[PDB]
Amino acid sequence: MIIYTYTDEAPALATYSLYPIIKHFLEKASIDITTADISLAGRILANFPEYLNEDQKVKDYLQILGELTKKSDANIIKLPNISASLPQLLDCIKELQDKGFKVPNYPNEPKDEKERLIKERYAKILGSAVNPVLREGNSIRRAAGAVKEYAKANPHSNGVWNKNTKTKVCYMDGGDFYSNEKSKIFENSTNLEVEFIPKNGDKKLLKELNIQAGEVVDATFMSAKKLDEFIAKSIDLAKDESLLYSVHLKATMMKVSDPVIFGHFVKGFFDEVFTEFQGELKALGVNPNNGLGDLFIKIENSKLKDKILAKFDEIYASRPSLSMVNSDKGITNLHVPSDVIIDASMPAMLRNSGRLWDKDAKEVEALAVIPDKSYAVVYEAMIKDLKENGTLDPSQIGSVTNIGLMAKKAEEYGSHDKTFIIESDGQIIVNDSNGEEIFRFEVEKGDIFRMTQTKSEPIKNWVKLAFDRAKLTGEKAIFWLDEKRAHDRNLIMLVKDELKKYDLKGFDYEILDPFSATLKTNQTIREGKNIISVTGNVLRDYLTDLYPILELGTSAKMLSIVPLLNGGGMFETGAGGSAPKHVEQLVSENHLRWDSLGEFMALIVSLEHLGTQNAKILAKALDKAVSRFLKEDKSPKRRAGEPDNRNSHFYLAMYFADELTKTELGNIYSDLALNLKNNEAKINDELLSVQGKSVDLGGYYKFDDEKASLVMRPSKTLNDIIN
Ligand SMILES: NC(=O)c1ccc[n+]([C@@H]2O[C@H](COP(=O)([O-])OP(=O)(O)OC[C@H]3O[C@@H](n4cnc5c(N)ncnc54)[C@H](OP(=O)(O)O)[C@@H]3O)[C@@H](O)[C@H]2O)c1
Numbered sequence: 001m002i003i004y005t006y007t008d009e010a011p012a013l014a015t016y017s018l019y020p021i022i023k024h025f026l027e028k029a030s031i032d033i034t035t036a037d038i039s040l041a042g043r044i045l046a047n048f049p050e051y052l053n054e055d056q057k058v059k060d061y062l063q064i065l066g067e068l069t070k071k072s073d074a075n076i077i078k079l080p081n082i083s084a085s086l087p088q089l090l091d092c093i094k095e096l097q098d099k100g101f102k103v104p105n106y107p108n109e110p111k112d113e114k115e116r117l118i119k120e121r122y123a124k125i126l127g128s129a130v131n132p133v134l135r136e137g138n139s140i141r142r143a144a145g146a147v148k149e150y151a152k153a154n155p156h157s158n159g160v161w162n163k164n165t166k167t168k169v170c171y172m173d174g175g176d177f178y179s180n181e182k183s184k185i186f187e188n189s190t191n192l193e194v195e196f197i198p199k200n201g202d203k204k205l206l207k208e209l210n211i212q213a214g215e216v217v218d219a220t221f222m223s224a225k226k227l228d229e230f231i232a233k234s235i236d237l238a239k240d241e242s243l244l245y246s247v248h249l250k251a252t253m254m255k256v257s258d259p260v261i262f263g264h265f266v267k268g269f270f271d272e273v274f275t276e277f278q279g280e281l282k283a284l285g286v287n288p289n290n291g292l293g294d295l296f297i298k299i300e301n302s303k304l305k306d307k308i309l310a311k312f313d314e315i316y317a318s319r320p321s322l323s324m325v326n327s328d329k330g331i332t333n334l335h336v337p338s339d340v341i342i343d344a345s346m347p348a349m350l351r352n353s354g355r356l357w358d359k360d361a362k363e364v365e366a367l368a369v370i371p372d373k374s375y376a377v378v379y380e381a382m383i384k385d386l387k388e389n390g391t392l393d394p395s396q397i398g399s400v401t402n403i404g405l406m407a408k409k410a411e412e413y414g415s416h417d418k419t420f421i422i423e424s425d426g427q428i429i430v431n432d433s434n435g436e437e438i439f440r441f442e443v444e445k446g447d448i449f450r451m452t453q454t455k456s457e458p459i460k461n462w463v464k465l466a467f468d469r470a471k472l473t474g475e476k477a478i479f480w481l482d483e484k485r486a487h488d489r490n491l492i493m494l495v496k497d498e499l500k501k502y503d504l505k506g507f508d509y510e511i512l513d514p515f516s517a518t519l520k521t522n523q524t525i526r527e528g529k530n531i532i533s534v535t536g537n538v539l540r541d542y543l544t545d546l547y548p549i550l551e552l553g554t555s556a557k558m559l560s561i562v563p564l565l566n567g568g569g570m571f572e573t574g575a576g577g578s579a580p581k582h583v584e585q586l587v588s589e590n591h592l593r594w595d596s597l598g599e600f601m602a603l604i605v606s607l608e609h610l611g612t613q614n615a616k617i618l619a620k621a622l623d624k625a626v627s628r629f630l631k632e633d634k635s636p637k638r639r640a641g642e643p644d645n646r647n648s649h650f651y652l653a654m655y656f657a658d659e660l661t662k663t664e665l666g667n668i669y670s671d672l673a674l675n676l677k678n679n680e681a682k683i684n685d686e687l688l689s690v691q692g693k694s695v696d697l698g699g700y701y702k703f704d705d706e707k708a709s710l711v712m713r714p715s716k717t718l719n720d721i722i723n
């Protein structure tokens with residue numbers, strides 16, 4: 001059984017067109033496949049059944065697939081899905097209520113234990129709820145030969161870069177998680193205790209943790225005062241040097257830390273509003289953590305509305321130009337916490353000649369504020385090397401493979417339950433079963449305290465993948481590990497320990513700090529050689545947007561293979577997200593520029609993994625079909641009135657069917673091959689000719705299925721072939 005994930009936004013809409021096609025082909029080969037609704041709307045419905053009519057209820061597909069990942073064999077095609085910010089959860093709740101799905105309001109401040117439990121249910125739904133539960137395995141992300149050869153044959157622009165390019169990252173120097181980090185390997189299984197001790201007040205037990213034999217636990221904090229001084233410093237450096245102010249966080253997955261960090265940026269930039277209106281904004285229930293969008297919604301009803309708006313205008317005037325998400329709608333990099341996400345936002349910036357957009361959609365060289373230095377140094381290096389050697393030439397450069405440590409919520413991706421905001425000046429102490437003081441921190445009011453767990457089987461497995469992949473291909477493999485970080489220093493000892501079990505003859509490997517590892521991998525791919533990155537859970541994410549965007553245009557054209565520790569497979573339809581922007585263009589203009597190429601390729605490896613006589617026949621033929629797809633350049637176009645996602649589904653269908661008539665399954669596919677060849681022009685015209693009008697999908701987070709299929713499946717003659 002293959003499970004296909006129904007998710008959100010762009011891939012959700014693609015799936016309305018592509019799934020019936022996948023389905024037609026697998027059914028005819030007696031291969032079993034279904035969908036699972038892990039959409040943000042579906043997850044919410046599945047979690048509040050007691051509020052719903054029976055036909056409204058949704059199975060807890062997150063729980064079902066979580067179980068499946070631990071089973072001796074599982075086959076999941078995982079499409080990108082929303083890691084919700086609060087403003088997205090609030091918008092999804094609304095959309096459901098308005099449609100008579102009667103789910104409860106988010107209580108910001110619960111009155112009773114009833115409202116307490118409801119806030120805690122929604123809190124589990126916020127942020128990266130799905131990926132950390134499904135990722136019961138480490139990660140292989142790489143560009144298939146045929147996809148790289150497409151990039152080389154059909155090169156995108158990586159813009160223009162020189163010593164005159166004034167684009168720069170800005171990160172804190174002391175005060176950040178990197179500076180304050182401590183770590184410990186645990187040889188024996190002990191139980192930990194995290195207690196706060198305020199210089200006046202009672203002690204408090206913040207957290208209890210089961211630690212197992214082998215686990216690396218770290219602890220750290222960011223200083224609210226260093227953060228606040230750094231934000232002011234970073235704002236005045238922007239204004240001085242005439243750089244556009246841009247802020248790149250992870251307020252999605254980092255669902256406790258990064259909205260808090262994000263709120264300091266909003267309080268910091270607009271400090272005169274949070275001074276003149278401290279009490280009015282409090283009374284209106286304004287949390288700066290939610291962005292300007294929630295603030296402007298909350299001051300619609302305030303006697304001081306216009307006086308608040310004239311104050312913004314006065315601040316914008318004294319301040320450096322703010323990076324915009326949407327210039328036409330006045331939406332800023334500080335309107336909604338989920339809109340600018342570092343992994344996607346920094347490489348779009350780098351490709352566009354280090355330019356981002358201002359109020360008037362003018363492209364302007366940017367200050368890239370990334371508070372923590374741990375990963376900021378990666379973009380610094382990348383930026384240094386673009387200035388020295390010019391842009392990375394997609395037609396010339398070699399390919400970065402990533403072996404990413406993920407399994408069992410490794411490193412900062414399991415930190416949400418272990419992140420706390422310090423109520424008052426005090427100290428954190430952390431103790432074991434015996435009662436030994438393992439960590440201690442002098443912390444202050446507003447300080448962001450955090451810990452992390454990375455276990456031994458995850459680390460041990462992650463080495464085997466990098467070793468085995470390097471023996472397979474001959475490529476150099478760099479472990480990106482900063483000896484100036486305690487967490488990293490513990491991983492070096494653990495890699496070194498584990499490599500003593502392996503024959504290191506043939507295994508070309510270095511260990512470099514992320515800064516140095518970046519210049520070495522850039523140096524290697526300029527020459528045109530392939531290289532392997534062996535990284536942590538966050539670099540896994542950052543690097544498989546960075547290099548893939550530079551080398552292929554979008555990270556969605558990558559393979560993303562997760563060999564689950566219990567022997568299943570999860571295959572992710574690229575290294576990208578749910579591309580909300582593609583949705584805006586589908587609504588307004590009936591053109592989806594979403595490329596499904598990562599879905600095609602996920603499906604190829606899903607079939608190899610199935611490994612049935614027919615699965616291998618459909619895999620080998622689909623691979624040939626995708627090669628033809630890339631040779632004939634069928635990938636969607638961007639402008640309305642040009643062929644889109646739907647047309648590309650058609651061309652893959654035609655090519656797949658054709659390729660299957662050459663195989664032992666030919667008789668089965670002969671009529672489909674002929675019917676799609678003979679209707680090529682008629683079908684392409686049916687799909688094009690609906691483009692250039694706005695469309696009613698009946699929703700955004702939850703579509704009206706009838707309307708979504710009419711928009712995504714608008715070709716009667718393709719439909720009559722496919723069903
Ligand atoms: N579940 C996952 O694995 C995963 C991973 C990352 C992000 N997300 C989620 O996705 C949402 C958006 O995240 P984001 O804004 O960081 O990044 P995003 O969806 O990856 O960024 C989208 C931009 O990258 C290009 N792109 C991405 N996928 C593409 C595809 N299949 N075909 C063609 N171009 C593609 C597109 O650029 P153009 O505009 O130039 O066309 C798009 O605007 C968030 O809700 C986030 O939580 C999920």
Ligand SMILES: [Mn+2]
Pocket residue numbers: 343344545575576577
């Ligand atoms: Mn992304």
